[PDB]
Amino acid sequence: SGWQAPGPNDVRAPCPMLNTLANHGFLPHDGKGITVNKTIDALGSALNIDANLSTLLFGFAATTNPQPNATFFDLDHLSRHNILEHDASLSRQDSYFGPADVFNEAVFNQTKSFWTGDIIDVQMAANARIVRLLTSNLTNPEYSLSDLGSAFSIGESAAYIGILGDKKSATVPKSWVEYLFENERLPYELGFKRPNDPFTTDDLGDLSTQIINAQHFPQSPGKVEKR
Numbered sequence: 526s527g528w529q530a531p532g533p534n535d536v537r538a539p540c541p542m543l544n545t546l547a548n549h550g551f552l553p554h555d556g557k558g559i560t561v562n563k564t565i566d567a568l569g570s571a572l573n574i575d576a577n578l579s580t581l582l583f584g585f586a587a588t589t590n591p592q593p594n595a596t597f598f599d600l601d602h603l604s605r606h607n608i609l610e611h612d613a614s615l616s617r618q619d620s621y622f623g624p625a626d627v628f629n630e631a632v633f634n635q636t637k638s639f640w641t642g643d644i645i646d647v648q649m650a651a652n653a654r655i656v657r658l659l660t661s662n663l664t665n666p667e668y669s670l671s672d673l674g675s676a677f678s679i680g681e682s683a684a685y686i687g688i689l690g691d692k693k694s695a696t697v698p699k700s701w702v703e704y705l706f707e708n709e710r711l712p713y714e715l716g717f718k719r720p721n722d723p724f725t726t727d728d729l730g731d732l733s734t735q736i737i738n739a740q741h742f743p744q745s746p747g748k749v750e751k752r
């Protein structure tokens with residue numbers, strides 16, 4: 526009860542959380558036909574994301590629909606390279622090597638190695654993201670990161686801390702984040718509980734600023750801080 530894997534006619538995204546929400550049925554389980562009201566209600570119901578943040582993210586998602594000025598998207602629209610989907614993902618390979626939508630064990634093993642305690646803090650999250658950016662630049666001859674992609678990358682690391690964990694301490698249990706990525710299921714049994722306070726655009730911006738502030742390069746090696 527409450528969760529079912531995708532089947533052969535269902536579509537999924539490069540987003541661990543939207544995939545999780547579709548697997549649970551907060552979003553349509555086939556991944557298709559997601560509108561702004563469905564996004565607001567699903568992310569509100571599951572996670573207590575604010576309507577305004579849900580609407581902002583919906584607006585970006587709709588730009589990935591190949592139909593112009595669309596009022597919906599399908600989860601696989603989000604996989605289109607270099608719209609929202611970007612290189613140096615934490616758990617997906619770069620498009621150049623292989624499909625950038627599905628979980629990739631080799632890539633996630635790299636990320637996990639920078640989560641060095643039982644509790645992930647901002648420093649660990651920033652560290653992991655950094656190593657992915659530099660690794661992709663040095664191994665992918667087609668590596669790119671647009672301004673929007675950089676903003677998305679920073680906000681994805683802010684999101685797993687603040688939405689799955691405690692936005693005020695800016696920490697999250699490592700096991701919870703691992704579980705989300707590796708199962709695309711919410712880690713209720715490990716202790717996750719939907720927060721009582723809504724998660725807002727300003728919350729995401731505050732954690733994104735914290736991520737950037739935890740980066741200590743002597744000199745920035747490419748696009749590491751663009752919002």
Ligand code: HEM
Nearest residue numbers: 539540542582586603609610611614615616617681684688
């Ligand atoms: C309508 C809402 C959302 C949209 C449109 C969206 C879109 C995306 C997209 C396109 C990616 C792939 C970027 C890439 O790594 O190449 C992504 C990754 C991600 N999203 Fe979402 N997302 C949404 C909501 C959420 C929420 C609520 C969370 C909360 C935990 C979340 C957490 C993440 C994380 C952690 C990644 C990085 C995955 C990896 O780097 O391997 N997203 N999202």
Ligand SMILES: *[C@@H]1O[C@H](CO)[C@@H](O)[C@H](O)[C@H]1NC(C)=O
Nearest residue numbers: 629630631632633634635637
């Ligand atoms: C990821 O790490 C696991 C856990 O040690 C290991 O069994 C697996 O072979 C690794 N995968 C890659 C592709 O390195």
Ligand SMILES: *[C@@H]1O[C@H](CO)[C@@H](O)[C@H](O)[C@H]1NC(C)=O
Nearest residue numbers: 662668669670746747748749
């Ligand atoms: C990749 O690294 C080079 C330094 O070799 C830098 O000039 C470039 O901006 C980096 N690319 C991105 C997209 O960050």
Ligand SMILES: [Mg+2]
Nearest residue numbers: 610611612614
């Ligand atoms: Mg990617």
